[PDB]
Amino acid sequence: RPLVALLDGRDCTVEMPILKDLATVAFCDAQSTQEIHEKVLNEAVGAMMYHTITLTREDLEKFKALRVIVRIGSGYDNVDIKAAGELGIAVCNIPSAAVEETADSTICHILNLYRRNTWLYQALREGTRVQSVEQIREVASGAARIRGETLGLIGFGRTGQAVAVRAKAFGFSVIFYDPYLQDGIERSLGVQRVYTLQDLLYQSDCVSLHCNLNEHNHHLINDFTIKQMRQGAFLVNAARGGLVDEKALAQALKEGRIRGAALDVHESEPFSFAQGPLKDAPNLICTPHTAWYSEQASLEMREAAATEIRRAITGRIPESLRNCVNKEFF
Amino acid sequence: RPLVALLDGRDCTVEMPILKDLATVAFCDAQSTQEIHEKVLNEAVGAMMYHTITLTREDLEKFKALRVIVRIGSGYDNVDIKAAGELGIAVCNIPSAAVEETADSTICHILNLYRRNTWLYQALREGTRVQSVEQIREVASGAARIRGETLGLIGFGRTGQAVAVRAKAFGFSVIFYDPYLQDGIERSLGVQRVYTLQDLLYQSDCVSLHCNLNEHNHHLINDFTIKQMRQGAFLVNAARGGLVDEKALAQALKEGRIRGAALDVHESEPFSFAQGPLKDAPNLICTPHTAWYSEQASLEMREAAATEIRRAITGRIPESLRNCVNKEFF
Ligand SMILES: NC(=O)c1ccc[n+]([C@@H]2O[C@H](COP(=O)([O-])OP(=O)(O)OC[C@H]3O[C@@H](n4cnc5c(N)ncnc54)[C@H](O)[C@@H]3O)[C@@H](O)[C@H]2O)c1
Ligand SMILES: NC(=O)c1ccc[n+]([C@@H]2O[C@H](COP(=O)([O-])OP(=O)(O)OC[C@H]3O[C@@H](n4cnc5c(N)ncnc54)[C@H](O)[C@@H]3O)[C@@H](O)[C@H]2O)c1
Numbered sequence: 001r002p003l004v005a006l007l008d009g010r011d012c013t014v015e016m017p018i019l020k021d022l023a024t025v026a027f028c029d030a031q032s033t034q035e036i037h038e039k040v041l042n043e044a045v046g047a048m049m050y051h052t053i054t055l056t057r058e059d060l061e062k063f064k065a066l067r068v069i070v071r072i073g074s075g076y077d078n079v080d081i082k083a084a085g086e087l088g089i090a091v092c093n094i095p096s097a098a099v100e101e102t103a104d105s106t107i108c109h110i111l112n113l114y115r116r117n118t119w120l121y122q123a124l125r126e127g128t129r130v131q132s133v134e135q136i137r138e139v140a141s142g143a144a145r146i147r148g149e150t151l152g153l154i155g156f157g158r159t160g161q162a163v164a165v166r167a168k169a170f171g172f173s174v175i176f177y178d179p180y181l182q183d184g185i186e187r188s189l190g191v192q193r194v195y196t197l198q199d200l201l202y203q204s205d206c207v208s209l210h211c212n213l214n215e216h217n218h219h220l221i222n223d224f225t226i227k228q229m230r231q232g233a234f235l236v237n238a239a240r241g242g243l244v245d246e247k248a249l250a251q252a253l254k255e256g257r258i259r260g261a262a263l264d265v266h267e268s269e270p271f272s273f274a275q276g277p278l279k280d281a282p283n284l285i286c287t288p289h290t291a292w293y294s295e296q297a298s299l300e301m302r303e304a305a306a307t308e309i310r311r312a313i314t315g316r317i318p319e320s321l322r323n324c325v326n327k328e329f330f
Numbered sequence: 331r332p333l334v335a336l337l338d339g340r341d342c343t344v345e346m347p348i349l350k351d352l353a354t355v356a357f358c359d360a361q362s363t364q365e366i367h368e369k370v371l372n373e374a375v376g377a378m379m380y381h382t383i384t385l386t387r388e389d390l391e392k393f394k395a396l397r398v399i400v401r402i403g404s405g406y407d408n409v410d411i412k413a414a415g416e417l418g419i420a421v422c423n424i425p426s427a428a429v430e431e432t433a434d435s436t437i438c439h440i441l442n443l444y445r446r447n448t449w450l451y452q453a454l455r456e457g458t459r460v461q462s463v464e465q466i467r468e469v470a471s472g473a474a475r476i477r478g479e480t481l482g483l484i485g486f487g488r489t490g491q492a493v494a495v496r497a498k499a500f501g502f503s504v505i506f507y508d509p510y511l512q513d514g515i516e517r518s519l520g521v522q523r524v525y526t527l528q529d530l531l532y533q534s535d536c537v538s539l540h541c542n543l544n545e546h547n548h549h550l551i552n553d554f555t556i557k558q559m560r561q562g563a564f565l566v567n568a569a570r571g572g573l574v575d576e577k578a579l580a581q582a583l584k585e586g587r588i589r590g591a592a593l594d595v596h597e598s599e600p601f602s603f604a605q606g607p608l609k610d611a612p613n614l615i616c617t618p619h620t621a622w623y624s625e626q627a628s629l630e631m632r633e634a635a636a637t638e639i640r641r642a643i644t645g646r647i648p649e650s651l652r653n654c655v656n657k658e659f660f
């Protein structure tokens with residue numbers, strides 16, 4: 001019975017029945033490879049993992065039997081997939097759960113910056129009394145009219161498209177930058193496309209990240225590129241925390257160069273307001289990587305992942321696999 | 331130069347230049363009829379006011395010269411428009427300056443409930459550490475998939491229609507109840523219409539109020555009608571606080587019959603968490619009547635109000651008036 005290990009989780013209740021008849025399923029609840037038991041490293045043919053552990057070339061080399069890794073989720077930056085491919089290990093993801101969950105939460109972040117619902121709630125919990133209209137204008141200062149603003153999406157894949165489709169009804173003018181996309185999608189969805197990041201930042205009142213983290217876009221948002229943004233623009237990131245240099249963002253918020261930011265993801269997770277470069281940054285929203293979460297989505301993505309493993313077992317790797325992201329294999 | 335009085339405001343600066351050449355413009359910063367100076371009562375031909383003061387029949391009777399009242403805002407429940415009309419006073423409002431602002435704020439309240447953006451930010455401020463995937467699901471518990479949910483709007487006017495239009499893209503199934511509306515709109519906007527409040531409540535996972543407060547719908551949402559709502563429904567109210575019996579809502583929240591509520595308006599404003607019937611009610615979000623507000627909207631509506639006064643002075647009352655809401659006039 002081939003061994004399949006859930007690396008950075010304990011729960012295995014959705015996966016059990018789907019593989020029960022073909023494989024031994026075990027969990028390591030490891031936050032690091034160091035916490036992975038020797039039995040697993042040596043005899044595990046398949047692995048399933050979330051975003052909370054990282055597998056480098058060195059880490060991957062420790063696996064003596066591993067043939068397939070399945071990310072429960074869409075992101076796979078936390079796995080060195082070229083090394084994986086070179087060692088004869090196939091890597092897969094789940095591309096289609098939490099698309100709409102992430103789109104909805106992202107839109108929520110955007111509307112939260114523009115209308116200030118979260119901050120106004122906070123003001124009331126703090127005991128602020130709002131009697132006169134002048135006091136209302138005062139407390140809600142910065143609440144902005146959305147129709148006419150330009151929302152610039154970096155990455156126009158599944159989540160970006162999902163966000164655009166929702167953004168239109170609020171009166172956003174939607175534009176995107178995605179240098180790997182094929183020509184035409186802009187036309188299908190009736191949105192405008194720009195072909196440099198700079199053009200995107202120059203024209204945008206709100207910039208929202210929806211690209212996957214890769215070798216070439218680490219700190220995409222850095223001190224230099226922030227300076228390319230409109231004075232008092234909004235930044236939203238529900239993609240990957242490595243996309244943003246938080247020190248730079250920290251200063252921009254303080255200086256008012258960015259009117260506000262909403263972050264679901266961070267350079268170092270788990271996030272804490274007492275720790276890190278955003279410690280004392282003003283006008284900041286943070287959520288602890290929950291943009292994806294719903295009951296159905298969590299169930300759905302787990303079931304799909306188990307199903308990918310099942311294909312990996314019964315068939316040829318990587319041909320039988322539905323969502324393998326590393327054909328720089330063998 | 332005939333006197334135009336700003337009852338419950340201090341700032342008078344947008345309106346002055348628009349009227350300087352035709353009227354003396356003054357402000358009272360009055361919260362009640364009792365603080366209004368005798369000069370104004372005796373000599374004001376026109377009045378402009380917000381929502382923070384109320385004019386009863388007795389109050390309107392104290393005005394010896396008044397010919398027009400212009401509500402700076404859409405709501406005019408706070409003026410006895412029939413009494414005004416009987417005394418030969420025209421009442422107008424500004425019905426279209428904050429429609430989209432309010433729709434945007436409403437949708438923001440709804441998403442905050444469905445995705446828990448505000449509560450998750452709060453959880454983080456409270457120092458919750460969310461490291462493991464299992465822990466993420468725990469903090470985001472209740473976060474829901476929106477596609478398939480039924481959103482029921484009570485009142486399908488300007489804000490209601492604007493809200494409908496935005497809700498579609500999220501996958502909400504939109505249903506509405508509006509017993510004063512003509513037939514056909516349900517078809518134009520491609521949504522379902524129900525013909526009793528009970529049916530709307532039976533079918534809605536999320537109920538949102540967008541009706542004007544009038545003689546017949548005080549405490550529309552009460553102990554009785556809440557029992558017509560689905561177990562674990564959501565309530566959002568950005569219309570008027572008088573629509574909801576807060577005592578009733580408080581118990582429903584405590585008992586879980588209602589999973590959560592987001593309120594921009596209240597029976598008694600200004601709202602405080604330390605005071606009133608919702609004192610310690612769980613799963614509550616509140617904002618201090620800010621749904622309408624943006625710089626662009628505030629300016630727009632002040633200017634429109636001033637222009638309405640100008641028409642009242644230079645033309646025929648009520649014929650020259652654009653948005654007179656009480657042609658049960660003299
Ligand atoms: N916060 C969350 O919980 C959450 C949930 C889902 C996804 N995500 C993140 O969102 C990312 C995107 O998800 P998706 O399903 O939309 O992925 P996707 O692969 O369908 O789309 C990503 C798009 O970004 C583009 N892109 C890559 N690099 C870019 C760059 N430097 N500039 C501009 N565009 C670039 C790609 O061409 C691609 O079209 C995932 O990688 C994941 O890490 C986060
Ligand atoms: N929070 C804010 O700052 C803010 C901003 C704008 C409006 N409001 C409130 O929201 C209300 C709606 O604004 P609007 O301009 O969209 O109004 P509107 O006149 O365009 O539409 C309101 C609709 O509600 C309907 N209605 C009245 N009584 C009803 C009942 N018992 N059941 C169902 N429907 C009923 C009417 O038929 C009307 O079509 C205003 O009256 C105002 O009091 C609040």
Ligand SMILES: CSCCC(=O)C(=O)O
Pocket residue numbers: 049050051072073074075076098292
């Ligand atoms: C690893 S759980 C899913 C969250 C996410 O960001 C993703 O799907 O990539």
Ligand SMILES: CSCCC(=O)C(=O)O
Pocket residue numbers: 133379380381382402403404405406428569622
């Ligand atoms: C009186 S300022 C705006 C508040 C409001 O609810 C309205 O538009 O009537």
